[PDB]
């Protein structure tokens, strides 16, 4: 198939690309490299099925039109986005423009050329879990940051095209994802930051009281879920979560990762008003529709991730 | 108070303006007159509390910035929008730009100047009612047209500002509204169209099988609800419906309005894929928070509306 992966040079994107190339699809990447480098895709530089890596912006309407007009895509995995909650609080407009308007630009061309869209949403668009069964696709939404609001906004434009036009789309809500190729600095995820701090012999710092929880999904499991949603016509028109169905507090995550190599401290929460106290995924729908389940435990994923991070030092 | 009413020269808007002027607030209207004329506000042309009627576009970022920079608004009732489902299917972009992007432009200035926003959403953002209790604010959303998707998108940006910044906002979801000052042509609502057809001695035409239902809210009741949401700090942060809690099929509405003066026919539905089969409102939350309930029955509202339409012929 001919496939466009927006954000394909990013963390999750590069793993989506890897899987699609293993499956011998012709892949085009569209990525402005705002949050990544081509080091994430060097591995694929000699794969003839990686057709092009376009350094361009989903906000550039003319570029997006030309890209679809001059290719014949079957399928688009739309991962390109601004992803940082705090940045979206500091600067809502940029997050809105990238995550809602950029989506809309792509969606318009998907309709013009009958291109199925897998829209990468986020488990952040949820209000907190309230029990051990976790959050299903039927459970309440709560846009606690402009990032979350922009993602919900995008979801609803995407789904409107499915209803109004019968355009194949899937809205996916993976939970917090970690692993090799995730950044380790201030724009990184908590697992990457903590492992890197450990390797650097500096403390782990926990925002707030650390009791907040996350359901942490290893990136290779996430990428397989993302790809599966694109391949499945049964998924068309659906919202589908992915996660592990187990959560951990940030306090306990810090102890797991440090293993007492470094100290663990608390600091003022940067956005307690936008925090989600408990994130725990019910992924029964993904199991049913996609035959998907995660294979990598947190313990094993941390080990894999630390091996990767250490390899770059 | 100093109040901005976007869309204040429109159908519901002019009634909001009337109420705010009765309550002796200083009102500014921002309206591009894309779907209205100043005849809707002639009544107020000598009220010194109607400060300005700006013919300008909420999509014009510079105009919106200047408007807030050079006034000191307390409160904004944001009614300006593209409202037509079929137009949003024919041309999603224009509806998106007006209803989502335009909202965002206003919201950004509301944050800058601490202006409470009442966001006018729509009961269309709902999946169908499934019982006689009707649709509450907790019930499922389904963006069946790009209009509905654009409205849900806007809701989520608005609510994100309440969470991230503690900006006072209210998201209101009134159900289908009818009455004096609603247009009677192809861009009008079903009640206006049917009454006008009756007065013109031409048939009523019903889309599809006519079994679809609506909860029809008289405009003076709607406008009082809208205003109340703005006046109430208890409503801050909430989604709140308004409606009557009774529905009628389009077949039965046509018989009520015609009274057999004219024939009643069925024609192919213009967008059956985007229709909502049953719309019935649970307005208990509005009753509790706002002490609001509707006063005008459908029968009496039809009579009032027909008197008004006849007066213009
Ligand atoms: N990391 C997670 O925990 C997680 C969980 C759920 C969903 N998501 C979603 O998955 C997607 C990928 O996230 P990630 O963690 O890989 O982040 P990432 O930043 O590595 O990936 C996003 C990629 O999009 C590119 N990009 C950003 N804005 C763009 C624009 N305007 N035009 C073109 N390219 C642009 C970036 O340069 C980057 O390579 C995002 O949509 C994100 O919201 C991430
Ligand atoms: N009529 C209903 O049944 C109903 C029910 C629920 C919600 N609503 C919502 O109520 C609001 C008012 O609806 P209405 O029925 O009075 O329609 P309307 O068209 O009479 O009112 C909207 C007004 O906004 C103006 N406008 C449109 N786009 C604009 C732009 N870009 N900049 C500036 N002004 C602009 C129009 O000229 C018009 O006067 C809308 O937000 C609509 O979505 C309507
Ligand atoms: O150095 C860090 C980074 C993150 N967190 C916490 O870890 C969780 C996950 O944060 P991340 O930024 O990875 O993603 P988010 O869930 O906010 O998307 C949140 O509760 C953060 O407050 C932390 O305590 N210390
Ligand atoms: O001339 C008309 C206009 C409308 N309708 C129907 O009346 C209902 C209300 O339509 P309207 O356009 O007023 O508003 P909507 O609910 O679609 O916002 C819908 O089921 C329409 O199909 C109709 O049968 N004939
Ligand atoms: Cl995320
Ligand atoms: Cl804990
Ligand atoms: Cl409406
Ligand atoms: Cl009937
Ligand atoms: Na747990
Ligand atoms: Na009824």
CSV table of C-alpha atoms in Angstrom, one decimal, chain A residues 197-301:
chain,number,residue,atom,x,y,z
A,197,UNK,CA,18.8,11.1,35.3
A,198,UNK,CA,19.8,7.8,36.8
A,199,UNK,CA,22.5,7.3,34.1
A,200,UNK,CA,23.7,10.9,34.7
A,201,UNK,CA,23.9,10.3,38.5
A,202,UNK,CA,21.4,13.1,39.2
A,203,UNK,CA,18.3,12.9,41.3
A,204,UNK,CA,14.8,12.0,40.1
A,205,UNK,CA,12.4,14.9,40.6
A,206,UNK,CA,8.7,14.1,41.0
A,207,UNK,CA,6.0,16.7,40.4
A,208,UNK,CA,3.5,17.2,43.2
A,209,UNK,CA,3.0,14.3,45.7
A,210,UNK,CA,3.8,11.6,43.2
A,211,UNK,CA,0.6,9.7,43.9
A,212,UNK,CA,-0.8,10.3,40.4
A,213,UNK,CA,-0.7,7.2,38.3
A,214,UNK,CA,0.1,6.2,34.7
A,215,UNK,CA,-0.6,3.2,32.5
A,216,UNK,CA,2.7,2.9,30.6
A,217,UNK,CA,2.7,1.3,27.2
A,218,UNK,CA,5.9,0.2,25.6
A,219,UNK,CA,6.5,1.8,22.2
A,220,UNK,CA,6.8,-1.3,20.2
A,221,UNK,CA,3.4,-2.5,21.5
A,222,UNK,CA,2.0,1.0,20.8
A,223,UNK,CA,3.3,1.1,17.3
A,224,UNK,CA,1.8,-2.4,16.5
A,225,UNK,CA,-1.6,-1.1,17.8
A,226,UNK,CA,-1.4,2.0,15.7
A,227,UNK,CA,-0.5,0.0,12.6
A,228,UNK,CA,-3.3,-2.5,13.2
A,229,UNK,CA,-5.9,0.3,13.4
A,230,UNK,CA,-4.9,1.4,9.9
A,231,UNK,CA,-5.0,-2.2,8.5
A,232,UNK,CA,-8.4,-3.0,10.0
A,233,UNK,CA,-11.6,-1.9,8.1
A,234,UNK,CA,-13.5,-3.3,11.1
A,235,UNK,CA,-12.0,-0.4,13.1
A,236,UNK,CA,-13.4,2.2,10.7
A,237,UNK,CA,-15.6,4.7,12.5
A,238,UNK,CA,-14.4,3.7,16.0
A,239,UNK,CA,-12.7,5.3,18.9
A,240,UNK,CA,-10.2,2.7,20.3
A,241,UNK,CA,-7.9,2.9,23.4
A,242,UNK,CA,-4.6,1.1,23.9
A,243,UNK,CA,-2.7,0.5,27.1
A,244,UNK,CA,-1.7,-2.2,29.5
A,245,UNK,CA,-4.6,-2.2,32.1
A,246,UNK,CA,-2.2,-1.7,35.0
A,247,UNK,CA,-1.1,1.6,36.5
A,248,UNK,CA,1.8,2.8,38.7
A,249,UNK,CA,2.2,5.9,40.8
A,250,UNK,CA,5.1,8.2,39.9
A,251,UNK,CA,6.5,7.6,43.3
A,252,UNK,CA,6.7,3.9,42.6
A,253,UNK,CA,8.0,4.4,39.1
A,254,UNK,CA,10.8,6.5,40.4
A,255,UNK,CA,11.8,3.8,42.9
A,256,UNK,CA,11.7,1.1,40.1
A,257,UNK,CA,13.9,3.2,37.8
A,258,UNK,CA,16.4,4.5,40.3
A,259,UNK,CA,16.9,1.3,42.2
A,260,UNK,CA,18.4,3.6,44.8
A,261,UNK,CA,21.3,4.6,42.5
A,262,UNK,CA,20.1,8.2,42.9
A,263,UNK,CA,18.0,10.1,45.3
A,264,UNK,CA,14.3,10.9,44.6
A,265,UNK,CA,12.8,14.3,45.5
A,266,UNK,CA,9.5,16.1,45.2
A,267,UNK,CA,9.1,19.5,43.6
A,268,UNK,CA,6.1,21.9,43.0
A,269,UNK,CA,3.8,20.5,40.3
A,270,UNK,CA,4.1,22.5,37.1
A,271,UNK,CA,0.4,22.2,36.3
A,272,UNK,CA,-1.7,20.6,39.0
A,273,UNK,CA,-4.8,22.1,37.5
A,274,UNK,CA,-4.3,20.0,34.3
A,275,UNK,CA,-3.1,16.8,35.9
A,276,UNK,CA,-5.0,13.5,35.7
A,277,UNK,CA,-4.9,11.7,39.0
A,278,UNK,CA,-5.4,8.2,37.8
A,279,UNK,CA,-4.8,6.9,34.2
A,280,UNK,CA,-5.6,3.2,33.8
A,281,UNK,CA,-6.7,1.8,30.4
A,282,UNK,CA,-9.5,-0.6,29.5
A,283,UNK,CA,-8.3,-2.0,26.2
A,284,UNK,CA,-11.0,-4.7,25.7
A,285,UNK,CA,-12.2,-3.0,22.5
A,286,UNK,CA,-8.7,-3.2,21.0
A,287,UNK,CA,-8.5,-6.8,22.0
A,288,UNK,CA,-11.9,-7.6,20.4
A,289,UNK,CA,-11.5,-5.6,17.2
A,290,UNK,CA,-7.8,-5.7,16.5
A,291,UNK,CA,-6.7,-8.8,18.4
A,292,UNK,CA,-4.2,-6.5,20.0
A,293,UNK,CA,-2.5,-6.9,23.4
A,294,UNK,CA,0.7,-5.6,24.8
A,295,UNK,CA,3.6,-7.9,25.1
A,296,UNK,CA,6.3,-6.0,27.1
A,297,UNK,CA,6.1,-5.6,30.9
A,298,UNK,CA,7.1,-2.3,32.5
A,299,UNK,CA,10.1,-4.0,34.1
A,300,UNK,CA,11.3,-5.4,30.8
A,301,UNK,CA,10.5,-2.2,28.9
